[PDB]
Ligand binder design. Structure first.
Ligand SMILES: Nc1ncnc2c1ncn2[C@@H]1O[C@H](COP(=O)(O)OP(=O)(O)O)[C@@H](O)[C@H]1O
Ligand SMILES: [Mg+2]
Lengths: 55, 371, 66, 55
């Protein structure tokens, strides 16, 4: 037939598109999270040196 | 022993033993006395055909449902239906089996008390328990939160539940359901020339509604398209020939759900009573109810309703919340599957209304702790 | 809760599809080819019946024509 | 027919689940990156305050 092929292929394409988009988003989320952790760690030391400067 | 999970419903009686996947016997709940005279002698003509037998001899019967809107209006016929269900469709005497009936929310007390009195005196069951038809449909989905819209054939009710704690002040029960849609379809078919009047032909109109009607994603665009092209006109063959062609009656019949002004009802559609039921809940559980909206009941089987309802609620709801509509493929029997699961639980085994308890407090025991 | 959804969904997600495909394949194989072959066979028998009817009708009309 | 509809329904369940996961991951990325950039702005303001203290 004809309809089954096109509908099935389009739906599988939709699933694959959503999956890859989710993977890209999660990768960027993990990278941003680690960079945020770095920012926290540096900010604490910045606060400590600021406190010493103020003393 | 095993429990009998009966589910009276209104339009289809669904029953079966606890612990299975699907009801054992599903048959319309109609009792039809013959109306003509009858000349053949010895034909073995009975005085009332009930259940699925009266859907085959419906040409010479006057079918009449014993349950109007959730409530039961004709107790003798309902007793006959129960007797048939126990003895001929399941063939298990009720003297050796607990029963788990189901009841719509906000129903009259006398109905429930009479139901338990019948089950304990006539059929003489060991123990019976009555449960609200929406909690079971929530069981079947495997959730524990969510707001369930159980649009049956008699009455549409919308019970919100969070973390297992039902919110009794937020139940919105509306009496528009499948039967009113059948009557409205039968009333708008007359605009093409087809007149169905007899109570037997209501079944034919019901079959037309089930097989052809669908819910439009956008109503005005469909009304405009059906009035110009002819790509919608689907034909259907009556039980005797003379095919009929349904035009824009296809999506106008189930549209009554979202605009109850069509059949003259004042209230708002099923798309707005759900939002109102949510807004009556507390401010901190609205996100979970938004994300876990559950559909159940037969009438929610129209092709394309899970998208129309989501579009409507997304229009009403705040833009940030995510709106998700759970529409399992086993929608029709969702209540009964949930009933089977509930009856199969070990923790539930001590909640039955034992017969000695009924003997001590009378039929008013059902409103007491054993709910 | 929500842990039986896997054990009641994933099962039929593959087993049901495969079993229904098997049922369709076996039903088509059993039905279509056998029906077409049997109809051809019955058609050949029908043609032979037609020939026998023509022969008998002609011989009886030949004799009886008086 | 019969099996074809069920197979389509399976292909649609995969569609819904994949699409929902993709959307949720995208929302997670948006939230996480906003968190990181606000932390970076806080770090910048701390640097400026340290500069004023040094002056
Ligand atoms: N496949 C379907 N499509 C549209 N409507 C349906 C379908 N199946 C059932 N219905 C409607 O739902 C009703 C059955 O609802 P049901 O869930 O059996 O009610 P109850 O809650 O009393 O059991 C029927 O009267 C019919 O009008
Ligand atoms: Mg119901």
């Amino acid at each position: 037939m004809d309809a089954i092929k096109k509908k099935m292929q389009m739906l599988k394409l939709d699933k694959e598109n959503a999956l890859d988009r989710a993977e890209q988003a999660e990768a960027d989320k993990k990278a941003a999270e680690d960079r945020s952790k770095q920012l926290e760690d540096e900010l604490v030391s910045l606060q400590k040196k600021l406190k010493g400067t103020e003393d | 022993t095993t429990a009998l999970v009966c589910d009276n419903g209104s339009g289809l009686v669904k029953a079966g033993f606890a612990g299975d996947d699907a009801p054992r016997a599903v048959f319309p709940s109609i009792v039809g006395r013959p109306r003509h005279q009858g000349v053949m002698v010895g034909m073995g003509q009975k005085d009332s055909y009930v259940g699925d037998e009266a859907q085959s001899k419906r040409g010479i019967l006057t079918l009449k449902y014993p349950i109007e809107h959730g409530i039961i209006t004709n107790w003798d016929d309902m007793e006959k239906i129960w007797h048939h269900t126990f003895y001929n469709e399941l063939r298990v005497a009720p003297e050796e089996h607990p029963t788990l009936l189901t009841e719509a929310p906000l129903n009259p007390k006398a109905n429930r008390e009479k139901m338990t009195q019948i089950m304990f005196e006539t059929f003489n069951v060991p123990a019976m328990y009555v449960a609200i038809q929406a909690v079971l449909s929530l069981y079947a989905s495997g959730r524990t939160t969510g707001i369930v819209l159980d649009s049956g054939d008699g009455v549409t009710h919308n019970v919100p539940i969070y973390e297992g704690y039902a919110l009794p002040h937020a139940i919105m029960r509306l009496d528009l359901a499948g039967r009113d849609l059948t009557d409205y379809l039968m009333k708008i078919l007359t605009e093409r020339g087809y007149s169905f009047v007899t109570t037997a032909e209501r079944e034919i109109v019901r079959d037309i509604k089930e097989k052809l009607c669908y819910v439009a994603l956008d109503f005005e665009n469909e009304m405009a398209t059906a009035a110009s092209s002819s790509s919608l006109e689907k034909s259907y063959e009556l039980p005797d020939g003379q095919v009929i062609t349904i035009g824009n009656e296809r999506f106008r019949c189930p549209e009554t759900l979202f605009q109850p002004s069509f059949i003259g009802m004042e209230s708002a559609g099923i798309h707005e009573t759900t939002y109102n039921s949510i807004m009556k809940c507390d401010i901190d559980i609205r996100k979970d109810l938004y994300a876990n909206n559950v559909l159940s009941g037969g009438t929610t089987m129209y092709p394309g309703i899970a998208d129309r309802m989501q579009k409507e609620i997304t229009a009403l709801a705040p833009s940030t919340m995510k709106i998700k509509i759970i529409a399992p493929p086993e929608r029709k029997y969702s209540v009964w599957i949930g009933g089977s699961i509930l009856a199969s639980l070990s923790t539930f085994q001590q909640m039955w209304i034992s017969k000695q308890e009924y003997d001590e407090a009378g039929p008013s025991i059902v409103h007491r702790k054993c709910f | 809760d929500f842990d039986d959804i896997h054990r009641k969904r994933m099962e039929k997600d593959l087993n049901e599809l495969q079993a229904l495909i098997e049922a369709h394949f076996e039903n088509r194989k059993k039905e279509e080819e056998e029906l077409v072959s049997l109809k051809d066979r019955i058609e050949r028998r029908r043609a032979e019946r037609a020939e026998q009817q023509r022969i008998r009708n002609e011989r009886e009309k030949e004799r009886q024509n008086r």
